[PDB]
């Protein structure tokens, strides 16, 4: 099964430990997948569009 | 439900013959 | 002993349908076609004489009624008119005798044509695409090859093609002779007169044995359908109509309310106006295009009679609905087979609400006065004809109207021993409808035994059932021997009992055999029987609850309890008396039990006494 | 054998994949009761008997295979089995429960036995 | 904060008239004919109105129409001449809408319906293949028009399916619309896609593009340019053929982030451009692009009689139009007007269709003002342009997370309509694009900021937010206390810190609607059972004498001053007049006001809907104080039931699976007894053979049955009928003075009661008869109906029960005071149903008697404590046992029982058992039938069905199935034939039966006879056959039909 | 932020419509035809597929297919008729 | 009474073997009572009768 994981605070995300892997699928979608299981930090901010 | 099924028919009662 | 036997259908060949409406005259004149597209006459309301309701053609408007009025009553049976030539008989005929309509131009029949299996097209190895265009005027047909090289049998020629090919055969030097092309229902009547099926057969036969695969299955298909041809003697252009047949006109009434017509009226008269057109177009020698534009409309309007929106577009009626056509009356859940064959409104039926009747017995119902009042009236009839001084039946009658007393005593001692079926309006096995034996209660609702709520799957929250009682005596007597509510025990699914108490019952039941260390007045006193110990609850020395010990010989079953006695005393003598949890059996040394005194409370003394009391009656 | 029963008349039927000397046409759907004894016959005389497989049908599929045109046309698809029933010129002899309760004869199941 | 609860129905009635109407006539205000010489202008914005003929209650009384009629100035302008013949023309007569929401159409009170349809726009899917990717498709719908179709194919194409014809690549519609390869590659942001597109399927030019469209279009016909272009302009972009709407276009500018001016309601290329490149976006995952849904309440839109009548007025328009130019291009001189231009009949007829004879306009309910109140407003999702019940499934008849607020998750049908009508909730409200709204608090820094105005908010815009519900508890001020919060985001519920809730509900029962918001101790209760009782609520019947209940819930006051049948005084003075008929207010300082009462009148549902006076003469009377009231109202507020004492325990059976037992002083104390009037109708016709006359000189009738008519053949006014009385003496002229035959209008079987208005209508006295008619005689006959076995009765709570046993008060339980009970409940209906509420009004209820009071809970009152119903109940028990100084009244060990004893014996039960005082309804319906012999159908002779004819119980499928599971042979032959359809048959079957013979051997039924006819009629040649005894014979066919 | 893939592991009136009426269950489970052993067959490219070893060593070669059809199958005992993967088997 | 019938009932639905034969015999033999009566119910003497014959 499949789920997703949306943050709850806007700021600048940061990796730690986490190795993607950039799969291409025949259109051409280039899929992230982490080789490394690790953390994805969101470190504080205010966001401007 | 349709019109035709509230109509009676023409004939004798079997009470009347 | 049976009037028919089996019952045998076959595609009808247009002499059949001739058959089935030409009827002749004593003055020679054959009638049974319907020339005009006309019901009834606006001033007189009388139908015309060559039209969808003429008395010609399916039979005199009333009864023993001539069309002009010369000939009235009964005494001219069999006499058919002079000035008009309407048979004066019975009007009933009116829904037997059907005529039919004979066409300018063929037409094929949709079922044949629009089909799962394409039978025309199957037997004439051809996709249904061409053969549909071939019927509908969108292109012709090779018929006949001739001497032309390029043009081979049943080849598909479009218009452009054809003008084309009429340019080469019009040319000073063509040596072209014998070309034939059709467009219509007619070349589909030629290619079906072709068909030798008795060749057709062997070279299919010699071409399957040499095949596989998906050709192998249509050659299959081919084959079945020519065989079923060959065995039938049935002649496959008989599925190009030449003649239609029309339905009585009582089949299709139109009636007054305002007129209400069916719409088979409104089909037939389109057939009747295409046809006539048609004929006059062929008759003053009119331009190609509109007869054959006429031709395909007749072929349209054919259609939409036989089955309404299977081919071309659906012919709405005044409003924007589809007409009902043939094929829509004896198909769906509203169609005939469901709606009037397989299940059917019946007389001397009643519906109401029911309630719980408590006292009633299983194999009892409580019917209201006024439902069985009118249920079993002519039975109240016959007797107060009989056992009474009722003269006629129009003063029973009117007793009956005025509810007079003795009409109660006379339905009180008619309904007695009479059964009587009810049943829940889902009927989801057999048990949904049970006969029972009426009681004259006063009342709107049907008051209903509780045991049987469960087989019913009924709750008084404003469920209705419905009352059919039977009439004959062999009726009556399946009704009391089989459908009895007293002999349905058991679940015809499962087995297991269906009559069970529950609810309050089974609630009454556990308090009753309960046990309650709260209130035990009068514990551990010993009693002779157990009526002795029910007579002492029952005056309150002992209260309901409490452990006491009664001398019963039988045997018992107690939960809880211990095979092994937990307490055995001999005495100054060859007896022992062992005492369990629950019992106390003095036996003989060696010997046999001389009594046995069972620890109970008087709710399952009165449990079990009233289970024995039951048995033993 | 409430399910049993209805599993059998699921489970009785076979496609004759390649007939002998038979009157089975390859593509039919025949009992299995009926292609063995007609095979015993056939091959007690000395014939070529047929092939057949076991086939699966379905409550619907199964209904409409029936030996009589009544009840199937009162049952689904009118137009369609009135149509192949005309063109096999197909009789129906009145053995069901639906066919006598169609017609007004008393059904042969009950006290209408015989 | 209510506001009024029905208007939905007259801000979209005020909206037609203001804006609704002027905006369809102008439309199509500009007429021309195809010569170009005479032009017809509409000033459709100074179209006055009439003034209505007769009145509201004329109009009522009379059987007619309650409307005005329309005339709207016009100028017949000569392009050449100039005359200009300036005129005022008759459009049509539009029925108006009363000051309670409601039409009367045909002398019947009528409501138009709310439809809840798919807002126009474009919405966005996404589909997975068996084994292949996800491919993205775009549908674009608009108001009214043809819908645009756009799909992604597996390799990455991009294709167009106008209307339900074979897709067609992109390019052709593009380059149709006349747009060049730069400004199509500028707008989109991802141009190799359609890059692809173009290279697989090749560039098409303007001229071609139209060819192959054309070609794709209309098969069969020669290509052409100018072909192409006129057939896109008719699709879409003809003002009259398509239009988006200003609910379309805002969606539009809204979904694809345009900016296209609101007056424009055709497709633009900019938005098909648009369109795709949002395809393309949500195809490579872009990241502001998202898939659409169908269920949520922001993408669905509400349509009431405006929006109705105004599509049933561009209908009669257009049709009117193409009268107009009919009957202006033949004309050969201009001696034309435009009075006599303009015909009226086509938008009459459809005005009269909509209002007459659609399924949005619906019979009125109007069995109490309950029913009446949430009758408008409801909303469905079936109709011309929504729904159908065979395609409706599973997913549309859910609750979707976007209801909250906005629609009732309880009120619904039971059946085949569950899920498909709904109930606006409380405080919800439409606004003028079409979309529920419902309103809020602002919550600022955790403060609930109730000073501010509430702020309303639709379904998408409360989903960035965090919403807190209704029954959260704030302190003194606004904080909100506690320290986590149950909060809605994104369509979920979660709970967060009271520091970042932005908004909360306004009360706790925004969630519910009217019905349902009068419960009491709602929480308590399952949510089917509280479906039971919300619709059962609807399902009373007004009584003799209505009382209040004892354990409201606040919202009975607000509930019956919509249904407009309670009076109040508008002006703080003195009452000088009070009559039965008529109530005067003098002003304390100024004029006289004056008030008139309906009485004793008839309800679509044959209740009564009376009006009675509260107040005395010469009393003082203050604004807004209640003057007069309903049939279901007390003093102000809904009274649909009583109270009444109820035990919970079961009696001798009578309480078996739901059934009721109750008391006779329910019978004797006319409690539970109501007034209903029905309505009779005979018709004085014209046959052939001479009129028919009213009078009576009716044949083979005594002087005994001609008591109480009139001396014209019309019973009296005040004349008690019993069954089979006759109530107007007609006479048909038979063909065959002796000639006369009888068919004077008579009582039903199972009718009785008092006559109360006899009405004729004749066409000399100027009223409106059928066509063929020459008399229209109406009577209302009364009666006045007790509680009996066979009733329904119910409570708030979902539990319904027929009753069963009516016993003396000397059998029933009492208590120990000696009062016997009212009603004894079942408990085991209580647990398994899960409606526990009931068990705590009762309770209430009982302290509400014994205290002289009155309790008002509002449903989920437990945010003030951790059990506020049940302390707030044992508390006033006991306040009560205080007051009234009984300790029986209250006990400590068990607290809602007391001892009761058997009234037969004399003896107390074993326990004490739970009494209260419930609030019981008597709900409507007259369903008694039976039948031996009567009418039967035309085509199969077997019997017609329904109370009103005689009918017939139908003897289905099942039921034959069942007989043939017993065995039974007989008993099914005898039904199939005998008792339905064998013709001749039956008269044997009787006659036997009268005589007492055997009944005789059945044969073939008629309907297997007409089966076999409608066979042959189809070209089938099927016969029945008699098999040969012998060899050498043939079968012989059998002739069934003699 | 991020799409989780995982695992997991654990009937009415539409069963036993479809298992009367004889149609072919979607999530169609895999049939043995002969008896052998159970190689399961873990690729490179996780080409899981039920390679069966007959009496005289004849291969079957069924493919598992996509991750939907959970593999339950490693009796090394199968025999004809027998399933190897999880939901309802095909009776025709 | 009904209970009396109800017993013999019960009795001759035994000792037949065919619910239906016996259900049949008993409707013959009360169209004969009746028919020979008219010259209690038909179907109730039959039942009495058949009960009283099984000895
Ligand atoms: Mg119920
Ligand atoms: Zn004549």
């Known amino acids: 099964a499949t789920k997703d994981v949306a943050t709850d605070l806007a700021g600048e995300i940061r990796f730690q430990d986490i190795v993607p892997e950039e799969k291409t699928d025949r259109q051409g979608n280039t899929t992230r997948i982490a080789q490394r299981g690790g953390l994805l930090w969101v470190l504080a901010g205010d966001v401007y569009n | 439900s349709r019109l035709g099924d509230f109509i009676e028919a023409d004939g004798e009662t079997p009470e009347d013959e | 002993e049976q009037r028919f036997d089996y019952v045998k259908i076959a595609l009808a060949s247009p002499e059949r349908i001739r058959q089935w409406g030409e009827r002749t005259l004593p003055n020679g004149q054959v009638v049974g076609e319907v020339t005009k597209p006309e019901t009834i006459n606006y001033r007189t309301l009388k139908p015309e004489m060559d039209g969808l309701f003429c008395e010609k053609i399916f039979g005199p408007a009333k009864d023993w009624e001539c069309h002009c009025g010369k000939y009235k009553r009964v005494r001219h049976r069999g006499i058919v008119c002079e000035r008009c030539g309407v048979e004066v008989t019975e009007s009933r005929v009116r829904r037997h005798r059907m005529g039919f309509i004979k066409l300018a131009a063929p037409v094929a029949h949709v079922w044949y044509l629009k089909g799962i299996p394409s039978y025309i097209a199957i037997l004439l190895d051809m996709p249904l695409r061409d053969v549909e265009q071939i019927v509908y005027f969108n292109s012709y047909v090779v018929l006949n090859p001739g001497n032309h090289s390029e043009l081979q049998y049943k080849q598909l020629l479009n218009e452009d093609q054809w003008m084309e090919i009429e340019d080469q055969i019009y040319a000073e030097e063509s040596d072209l002779e014998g070309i034939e092309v059709g467009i219509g229902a007619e070349a589909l009547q030629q290619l079906l007169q072709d068909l030798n099926l008795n060749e057709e057969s062997e070279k299919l036969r010699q071409e399957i044995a040499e095949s596989k695969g998906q050709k192998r299955a249509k050659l299959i298909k081919r084959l079945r359908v020519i065989d079923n041809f060959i065995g039938t003697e049935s002649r496959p252009e008989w599925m190009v109509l030449n003649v239609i047949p029309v339905i009585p006109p009582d089949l299709r009434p139109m009636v007054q309310l305002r007129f209400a017509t069916s719409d088979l009226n409104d089909l037939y008269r389109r057939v009747i106006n295409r046809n006539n057109r048609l004929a006059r177009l062929q008759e003053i020698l009119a331009p190609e295009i509109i007869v054959r534009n006429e031709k395909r409309m007749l072929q349209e309007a054919v259609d939409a009679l036989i089955d309404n929106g299977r081919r071309g577009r659906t012919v709405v009626g005044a409003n924007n609905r589809p007409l009902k056509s043939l094929s829509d009356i004896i198909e769906g859940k509203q169609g005939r087979f469901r709606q009037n064959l397989l299940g059917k409104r019946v007389d001397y039926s009643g519906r109401s609400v029911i309630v719980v009747g408590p006292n009633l017995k299983i194999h009892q119902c409580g019917l209201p006065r006024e439902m069985a009042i009118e249920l079993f009236q002519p039975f109240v009839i016959h007797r107060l004809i009989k056992n009474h001084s009722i003269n006629n039946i129009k003063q029973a009658k009117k007793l009956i109207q005025k509810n007079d007393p003795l009409i109660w005593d006379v339905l009180e001692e008619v309904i007695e021993g009479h059964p009587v079926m009810l049943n829940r309006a889902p009927t989801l096995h057999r048990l949904g409808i049970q006969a029972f034996e009426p009681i004259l209660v006063e009342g709107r609702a049907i008051q209903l035994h509780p045991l049987v709520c469960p087989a019913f799957n009924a709750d008084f929250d404003g469920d209705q059932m419905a009352v059919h009682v039977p009439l004959s005596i062999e009726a009556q007597a399946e009704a009391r021997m089989l459908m009895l509510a007293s002999g349905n025990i058991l679940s015809p699914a499962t087995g297991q009992p269906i009559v069970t108490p529950s609810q309050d019952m089974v609630l009454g039941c556990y308090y009753l055999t309960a046990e309650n260390p709260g209130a035990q007045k009068g514990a551990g006193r010993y009693f002779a029987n157990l009526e002795d110990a029910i007579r002492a609850f029952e005056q309150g020395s002992v209260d309901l609850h409490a452990w006491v010990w009664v001398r019963f010989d039988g045997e018992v079953e107690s939960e809880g309890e211990s095979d092994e006695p937990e307490s055995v005393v001999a005495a100054d003598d060859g007896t022992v008396t062992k005492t369990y949890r629950f019992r106390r059996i003095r036996e003989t040394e060696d010997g046999q039990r001389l009594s046995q005194y069972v620890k109970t409370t008087p709710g399952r003394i009165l449990f079990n006494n009233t289970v024995q009391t039951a048995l033993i009656h | 054998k409430h399910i049993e029963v209805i599993v059998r008349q699921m489970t009785s039927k076979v496609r004759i994949d390649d007939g002998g000397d038979t009157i089975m046409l390859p593509g039919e759907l025949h009992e299995l009761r009926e292609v063995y004894n007609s095979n015993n016959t056939m091959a007690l005389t000395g014939m070529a008997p047929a092939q057949f497989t076991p086939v699966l049908l379905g409550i619907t599929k199964a209904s409409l295979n029936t030996n009589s045109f009544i009840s199937a046309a009162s049952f689904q698809e009118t137009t369609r089995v009135l149509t192949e029933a005309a063109i096999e010129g197909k009789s129906d002899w009145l053995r069901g429960l639906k066919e006598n309760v169609i017609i007004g004869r008393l059904i042969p199941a009950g006290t209408g036995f015989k | 904060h209510l506001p009024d609860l029905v208007a939905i129905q007259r801000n979209s009635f005020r909206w037609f008239l203001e804006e609704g109407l002027i905006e369809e006539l102008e439309s199509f205000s500009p007429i021309t004919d195809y010569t170009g010489k005479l032009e017809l202008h509409f000033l459709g914005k100074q179209y006055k109105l009439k003034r209505p003929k007769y009145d509201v209650d004329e109009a009522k009384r009379r059987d007619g129409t309650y409307s005005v009629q329309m005339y709207v100035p016009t100028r017949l302008i000569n392009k050449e001449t100039g005359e200009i013949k300036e005129q005022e023309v008759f459009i049509g007569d539009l029925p108006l809408m009363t000051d309670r929401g409601t039409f009367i159409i045909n002398g019947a009170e009528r409501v138009i319906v709310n439809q809840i349809v798919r807002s126009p726009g474009v919405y966005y899917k996404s589909e997975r293949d068996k084994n292949g990717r996800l491919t993205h498709n775009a549908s674009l719908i608009p108001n009214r028009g043809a819908w645009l179709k756009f799909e992604t194919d597996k390799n990455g194409l991009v294709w167009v399916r106008i209307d339900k014809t074979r897709k067609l690549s992109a390019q052709v519609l593009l380059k149709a619309l006349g747009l060049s390869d730069n400004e199509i590659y500028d707008k989109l942001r991802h141009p190799e896609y359609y890059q692809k597109t173009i290279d697989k399927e090749g560039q098409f030019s303007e001229d071609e593009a139209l060819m192959e469209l054309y070609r794709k279009l209309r098969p069969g016909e020669p290509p052409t340019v100018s072909g192409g272009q006129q057939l896109l302009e008719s699709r879409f972009f003809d003002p009259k053929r398509y239009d988006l709407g200003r609910v379309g276009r805002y969606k539009l500018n809204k979904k694809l982030g345009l900016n296209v001016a609101d007056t424009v309601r055709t497709l633009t290329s900019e938005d098909i451009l648009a369109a795709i490149d949002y395809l393309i976006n949500l195809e490579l995952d872009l990241g502001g692009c998202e898939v659409d849904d169908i269920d949520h309440l922001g993408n669905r839109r509400v349509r009431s009689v405006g929006e109705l009548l105004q599509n049933q007025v561009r209908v009669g328009l257009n049709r009117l139009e193409r009268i107009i130019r009919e009957r202006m291009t033949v004309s050969d001189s201009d001696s034309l007007s435009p009075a006599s231009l303009v015909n009226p009949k086509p938008l009459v007829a459809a005005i009269k269709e909509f209002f007459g004879s659609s399924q949005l306009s619906q019979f009125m309910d109007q069995t109490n003002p309950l029913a009446e109140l949430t009758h408008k407003r409801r909303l469905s999702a079936l109709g011309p342009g929504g729904l159908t019940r065979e395609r409706a499934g599973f997913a549309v008849r859910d609750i979707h997370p976007s209801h909250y607020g906005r629609i009732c998750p309880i009120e619904t049908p039971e059946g085949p309509n569950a899920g498909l009508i709904g109930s606006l909730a409380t405080h919800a409200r439409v606004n003028d694009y079409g979309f529920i709204e419902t309103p809020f608090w602002r919550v600022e820094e955790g403060r609930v900021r109730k000073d501010l105005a509430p702020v309303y908010m639709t379904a998408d815009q409360e989903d960035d937010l965090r919403v807190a519900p209704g029954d959260v508890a704030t302190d003194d001020a606004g904080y909100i206390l506690g320290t986590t919060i149950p909060v809605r985001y994104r369509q979920d519920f979660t709970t967060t810190t009271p520091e970042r809730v932005d908004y909360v509900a306004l009360s706790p029962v925004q969630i519910i609607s009217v019905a349902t918001s009068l419960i009491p101790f709602l929480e308590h209760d399952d949510a089917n059972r509280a479906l039971m009782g919300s619709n059962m609520q609807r399902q009373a019947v007004p009584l003799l004498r209505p009382e209040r209940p004892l354990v409201g819930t606040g919202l009975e006051p607000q509930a019956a001053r919509d249904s407009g049948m309670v009076i109040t005084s508008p002006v703080d003075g003195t009452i000088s007049y009070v009559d039965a008929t008529h109530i005067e207010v003098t002003a304390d300082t100024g004029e006289k006001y004056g008030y008139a009462l309906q009485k004793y009148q008839r309800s679509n549902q044959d209740t009564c809907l009376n009006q009675r006076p509260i107040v005395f003469e010469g009393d003082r009377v203050q604004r807004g104080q209640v003057i007069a009231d309903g049939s279901a109202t007390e003093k102000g507020e809904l009274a649909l039931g009583q109270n009444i004492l109820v035990a919970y325990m079961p009696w001798e059976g009578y309480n078996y699976e739901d059934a009721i037992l109750i008391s006779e002083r329910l019978v004797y104390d006319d409690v539970y007894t109501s007034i209903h009037i029905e309505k009779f109708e005979i018709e004085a016709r014209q046959t052939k053979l001479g009129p028919e006359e009213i009078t009576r000189e009716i044949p083979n009738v005594g002087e005994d049955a001609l008591r109480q008519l009139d001396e014209n053949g019309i019973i009296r006014v005040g004349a008690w009928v019993e069954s089979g009385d006759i109530l107007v003496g007609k006479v048909t002229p038979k063909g065959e003075a002796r000639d006369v035959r009888d068919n004077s209008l008579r009582v039903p079987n199972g009718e009785k009661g008092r006559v109360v208005d006899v009405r004729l209508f004749t066409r000399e006295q100027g009223d409106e008869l059928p066509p063929g008619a020459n008399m229209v005689v109406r009577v209302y006959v009364a009666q006045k109906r007790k509680i009996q076995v066979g009733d329904k009765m119910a409570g708030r709570h979902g539990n319904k029960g027929i009753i069963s046993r009516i016993l003396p008060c000397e059998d029933m339980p009492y208590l120990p005071d000696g009062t016997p009970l009212d009603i004894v409940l079942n408990p085991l209906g209580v647990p398994s149903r899960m409606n526990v509420g009931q068990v705590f009004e009762c309770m209430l209820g009982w302290a509400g008697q014994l205290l002289d009071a009155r309790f008002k809970v509002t449903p989920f009152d437990e945010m003030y404590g951790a059990e506020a119903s049940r302390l707030t109940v044992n508390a006033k028990l006991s306040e009560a046992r205080e007051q009234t100084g009984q300790p029986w009244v209250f006990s400590d060990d068990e607290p809602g029982k007391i001892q009761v004893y058997d009234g037969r014996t004399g003896e107390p039960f074993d326990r004490p058992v739970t009494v209260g005082r419930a609030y019981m309804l008597k709900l409507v319906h007259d369903k008694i039938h039976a039948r031996s012999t009567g009418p039967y159908s035309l085509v199969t002779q077997q019997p017609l069905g329904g109370k009103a004819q005689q009918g017939g119980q139908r003897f289905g499928e099942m039921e034959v199935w069942a007989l043939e599971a017993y065995g039974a042979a007989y008993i099914l032959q005898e039904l199939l034939t005998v008792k339905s359809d064998d013709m001749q048959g039956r008269n044997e079957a009787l006659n036997a039966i009268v005589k007492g013979k055997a009944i005789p051997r059945p044969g073939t039924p008629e309907s297997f006879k007409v089966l076999m006819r409608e066979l042959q009629s189809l070209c089938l040649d099927i016969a029945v056959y008699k098999a040969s005894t012998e060899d050498y014979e043939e079968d012989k066919e059998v002739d069934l039909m003699a | 932020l991020v799409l989780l893939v995982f695992e997991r592991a654990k009937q009415g009136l539409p069963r036993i419509e479809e298992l009367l009426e004889a149609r072919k269950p979607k999530e169609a489970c895999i049939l043995a035809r002969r008896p052998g052993v159970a190689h399961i067959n873990y690729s490179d490219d996780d080409a899981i597929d039920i390679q069966v070893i007959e009496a005289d060593g004849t291969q079957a070669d069924y493919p598992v297919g996509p991750g939907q059809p959970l593999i339950i199958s490693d009796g090394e005992t199968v025999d004809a008729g027998q399933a190897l993967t999880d939901g309802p088997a095909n009776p025709h | ?55």
């Not at chain 7, 033999?29 to 009768?49: C, F, G, S, T």
Request: charged share 30%; glycine share 0%.
């Open chain 7, 1 to 55: 009474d009904s209970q009396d019938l109800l017993f013999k009932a019960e009795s001759l639905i035994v000792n037949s073997t065919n619910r239906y034969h016996v259900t049949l015999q008993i409707a013959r033999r009360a169209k004969q009572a009746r028919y020979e009566e008219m010259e209690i119910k038909p179907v109730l003497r039959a039942i009495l009768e058949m009960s009283d014959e099984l000895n």
